[PDB]
Symmetry: D2
Subunit: 425 residues, 4 copies
């Protein structure tokens, strides 16, 4: 077939609303390699957007999936239960940070995970409002669009999203927002628009993904934890992207020295299959009356075993450790590039959640959304699949599977090195 031929049909059958980063149709993939319908091979650094921390179709994961496929694919837990769902919950309850009893709900998409986390926080505290941070991303349902700190294009032309969501400033010294500023912004909400007694939860990404890979410091999370504690507000850690080991630990919160009340997870949790969930303080999770929580596909059988296997593979294969190594390699590699390309104004990242911000002529005030896109474009023509993000589209985030070999690591770095040289000429 042909990529362009498939793109033409795409434009005829699918709405333009559905964006398309790379105009390539994949055919097969394996770990870090992807082959398009034209037979061309690529080194995947987007990882399906952090969904493949274990790589494309990890064998142990596929094996489990094939086995379950001989048994059953769906029943809808709420009608007839099944062990995989039960077993995954039990494991999340103990792996998700929190020195106390927890319970886990399994849904299907990261959006639904956040939707439920807030629902549960509201039923628990008996309050309606929530607070979210600038540059945050939490999903594409009406309510999660309101939580998401970005209107364009996610809400464009649709009108105002749900109310009673209040905006706080995410800490980010790189741009003049001090942890004191972030904390102050929360009190501002309490004083100006919504008293604590009306705030059911504060939703935050320990490390923002779509936001441009900006991380919270242990100190700030601790203050946030104290503030929430003082007002009986549930702290929700959206770990949909930062979770499943991307930061060096299974969940980023672990590195914050403090525990959330509720945690959402998805993407890499199932290494390539549709699964999401909420894990939180047991009594909070139970605040909802029976029949209150649910969903048809929720905690799908095949995805459950894949999740279980992903968790096994993480231990058997030492991914958490590799996640740190990989980040250090990419970070050193990228810094070597930064010594001959001032346009790269910052190399940051926790574990393997690495990213670089492109500024025009060094200046930390001139986002280069054009060079960024050029780098992506050039990178693709060289067989490297990259992704960008951040409120000013000048951030390159690397989400390559943790299972990547050193050769592919050097390979990718090299390709990114040229993209810049060939882009200054």
């Amino acid at each position: 077939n042909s990529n362009k031929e498939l793109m033409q049909r795409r434009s005829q059958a699918i709405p333009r609303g559905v964006g398309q980063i790379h105009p390539i149709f994949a055919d097969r993939a394996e770990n870090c390699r992807v082959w398009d319908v034209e037979g061309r091979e690529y080194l995947d650094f987007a990882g399906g957007i952090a969904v493949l921390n274990t790589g494309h179709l990890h064998p142990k994961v596929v094996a489990a999936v094939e086995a379950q496929l001989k048994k059953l694919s769906h029943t809808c837990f709420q009608v007839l239960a099944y062990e995989p769902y039960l077993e995954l919950c039990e494991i999340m309850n103990q792996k998700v940070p929190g020195d106390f009893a927890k319970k886990t709900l399994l849904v299907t998409t990261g959006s639904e995970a956040v939707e439920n986390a807030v629902k549960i926080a509201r039923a628990a505290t008996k309050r309606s409002g929530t607070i979210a941070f600038s540059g945050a991303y939490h999903g594409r349902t009406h309510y999660t669009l309101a939580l998401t700190g970005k209107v364009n294009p996610y809400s464009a032309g649709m009108g105002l999203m749900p109310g009673h969501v209040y905006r706080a400033l995410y800490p980010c010294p790189l741009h003049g927002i001090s942890e004191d500023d972030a904390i102050a912004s929360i009190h501002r909400i309490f004083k100006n628009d919504a008293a604590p007694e009306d705030i059911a939860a504060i939703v935050i990404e320990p490390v923002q993904g779509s936001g441009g890979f900006y991380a919270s410091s242990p100190a700030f999370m601790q203050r946030l934890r104290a503030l929430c504690d003082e007002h009986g507000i549930m702290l929700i850690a959206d770990e949909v992207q930062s979770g499943a080991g991307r930061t060096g630990t299974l969940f980023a919160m672990e590195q914050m020295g403090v525990a959330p009340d509720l945690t959402t997870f998805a993407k890499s949790i199932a290494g390539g299959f549709p699964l999401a969930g909420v894990t939180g303080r047991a009594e909070v999770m139970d605040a909802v009356a029976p029949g209150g929580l649910g969903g048809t596909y929720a905690g799908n059988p095949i995805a459950c075993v894949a999740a279980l296997e992903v968790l096994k593979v993480f231990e058997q294969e030492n991914l958490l450790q590799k996640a740190n190594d990989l980040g250090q390699k990419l970070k050193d590699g990228l810094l070597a590039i930064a010594e001959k390309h001032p346009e790269i104004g910052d190399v940051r990242g926790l574990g393997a959640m690495i990213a670089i911000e492109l500024f025009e002529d060094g200046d930390h005030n001139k986002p280069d959304a054009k060079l960024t896109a050029e780098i992506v474009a050039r990178a693709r023509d060289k067989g490297l699949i990259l992704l960008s993000c951040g409120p000013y589209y000048n951030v390159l985030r690397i989400l390559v599977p943790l299972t990547i070999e050193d050769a592919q690591i050097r390979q990718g770095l090299e390709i990114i090195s040229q993209c810049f040289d060939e882009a200054k000429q």
Copy 2:
């Protein structure tokens, strides 16, 4: 390895909010048969809630999945596209009622589907309000919970869901709501709370699911269509549960005599794998700006080929036909047991979407909810998995796979027969 023991583990690991219709754990299934961890075999008349119209792990579908499983399971379409997604959209564009160009978007869940169809309608009309009907069910997200016409237990303790969702009366003579009343109830909204110019769309289930399997007549649907046409209101047909040939036609709207501007689908579409989508008037679908639509697992690769394979199966095994028969057989068998039992006040159903509503002493004023629950429990004792529904939890709805053998149908009616005769001794 015991249902009881697993149920106890469940209470310690999973929230009570996730209801449990049957305290049984399924180990494996095949078409209409299901075996638990203990070994007991049941006959599934619930089909994972209208999800398995082609039966559990249908052989042709399973092979397709297995094939795709060797290639890839996820890339995130908006990043790297793939043919199965593109192909299905093309077929749905042709399969969904409406003699005009259409475009399709693939999401993951029925909730996401309705969510996007509303976003789409809003962007297209530049309006924020929506009208849904009493007894409707559209999802467990904040917004789809507002759309759903039932607070308990879906919203209990959570507070009020997003506003700007107005309630209309779903036509239902069996309870005193004439079609005229229904259309009038819509004019009431226009006069009292939200003018037509502020209503983006009117969402409706051609045939309500949890609502009690009540169906709209072509006449009504037609006035509804004319009313929307007059005001530029997008008519949304939520066919998440009525679709996939459950009523005889692939979509219930086909039998209504008019096309909707937007249609949502899920459940049986992929016969047991996580997938959902929205098909609508091309002009409308494109109203959303590029990058405004999308979800991480959207139109999952494996789920897609399963759906493609399910559509082939429908055409090859005449499932649309078997549905109409199966439905007729059920009605008759039930109408029979209704002779000896006045408790069965009504036996209705479109295609294979059949149901019976139990009443206290044949009194259409006293909904016998306790009797309903009684039969459910009794059928399970005799190996039959049934489901109840309706605003008064007094309705029994059959969602048995269309691929059920003639014997299992008698075997089914017999079991239900026993239950009624035994509950009356």
Copy 3:
């Protein structure tokens, strides 16, 4: 100094949003008489919209007001208190129906009264939702427009008004809506959009004003009281228009057999001066924290002494008894005019809150809005100021001062008779 001339200046300096029922500039008035800038005299049957029950410039009221002008006109009660405010509250605490301790807050307009009654009901119950009825009118502020069961023209073109206000049907048998349907419409909200525990109050007009002068029956009002009681919902009675003894009792609720938790009042309470208030169960009133209620002009000194004087008149001049007699004289006179003209399909009203509803050929489903508007126009030509109301604008309501002359009663009815004759001619 010409009407037409002043109207041209109007269009030039005042917004057209401010509708002008009669293109006339009143220069002076006295009891039921009004003279325009051209010197023409009119008989006032609108009464400034139920604001002048004691007539234009009642001698006793004006005298009281003049005395107060010599002392002070404003201080802002919450800053420096004054006695007229205090005295009026003590009196309202006794006069407002309800056999138990009460407390009163004084604001300035009817809309503020309703705003404050809901605020109070919310603080007292810890709930946010409210239920109002079809055809209801509660004010022009954002929230009260939401409560008002009429979008056009009040909130026309402004987008949707505040959410979390649900709509119930007002009992109106003339138009096929039984008290059973009305109560039922409330349970429908409880099951479909807002559970009792989220509803702070049910706001209702004992007799709808703008809504068509449709009155509630004691039987209905009673079922409503028990309903609220069962769910701890505050029953708010908006008597801004039905109050001030327009129905035969100081407050219409007195005739219902039950007492509300809160009652709003304005218009006639002060006989032509800016004043309004909320009276209710003491414990409910005190629910709002200190400093939570207030308003610059609230309970203005002149308005208060004016209201104190209005109350004496009602007592000294047997106005309630007069309201009842006046009502009968009017209805009988109207009933006679109807024996000739079939168009008049209804003649109703408690006390002096009288109105007639016109139909096309007496077809009780053909609101003859055109004729209603014509009768108004004709009456104006004959020196009779009238007002139409009702959802379909086919209702003429009489709000002539209770201090009307026997002769003016004959004259009003006569002019009306002429209008229906000269029109049907």
Copy 4:
């Protein structure tokens, strides 16, 4: 006839929600003097809260009031028009800054004004959102409470107020908020929660009253003007308190260098009688369909003539000029008392809108609400009525009539001085 006796009666008849700054009952007043029911004479430095810039019962104003009182007090302009209303609008149309044609709507309270200003902006832009500033105050109706940047106590226990109101930062270097930060806070809203095209207006006090008397600079207001121009957003200026000559010019905006699209006025416009309004771009004002703007008491006759006379009094008595002289003297006298007491960390104000902020040990981080509150008590014992304000209740504002005599200005400063000295040991 006893202050305490009346306070006792108040506690039994009126809800505690209604605060009480001074537990004194005024009997009569004249210009800047008030006498309680016990005969004690105080000097009024609060002015009914900026409502009496022409003093208590200004002889000219009263005379005007009495004349109208002989003609008519109410008709409801919507029903029968009258000249005082028309005439006042024409004068307002030309007095309010703006080289374009303007139209004026008259209502009754400042809350109604802001409410109406927003409805008009909404119809004109066909947008629903609004932006307001931190520490702002706009009224006590539901919607105006949401606009108001202060939850406590204005809405405690009540729950969340209407949404789709976003918060921007009011510029205030004295406390860290720069003009750039304020402008940045608005873009932030545009980027995170509500796009410019969904924002109908930006509401702002040229000089925050309740907020603590912080003035906006011309430069800042100009950037705000340009920003609204760029996005078709109506700029609403709330001059309810800053209006009517308090700042040295009739409207504070005159001193800003730009014109708003809409202006709300109240308080001192009528010198002690219930009246408020909205004056704005004519075509904006006319966006509301006829019949969409009303209010029973709206632009009351007596109050209208009072405003017309007040405006005349400002001219013949040179109040604007006196306002500036009064401000200077006060500020000089206060800066004097500020040399013996470091608690007075700031002396500010435009014209006669003067306020002093008290910090602890002159620590611009230690708001001394205790002292501030203590100064008010001592002052009242010395026959002087004062008021406090500010988000931290550490600001003393002076709203004494501009008609104050020179000796009364000394008397006031001497007393205020005597209050700070005595509060030292």
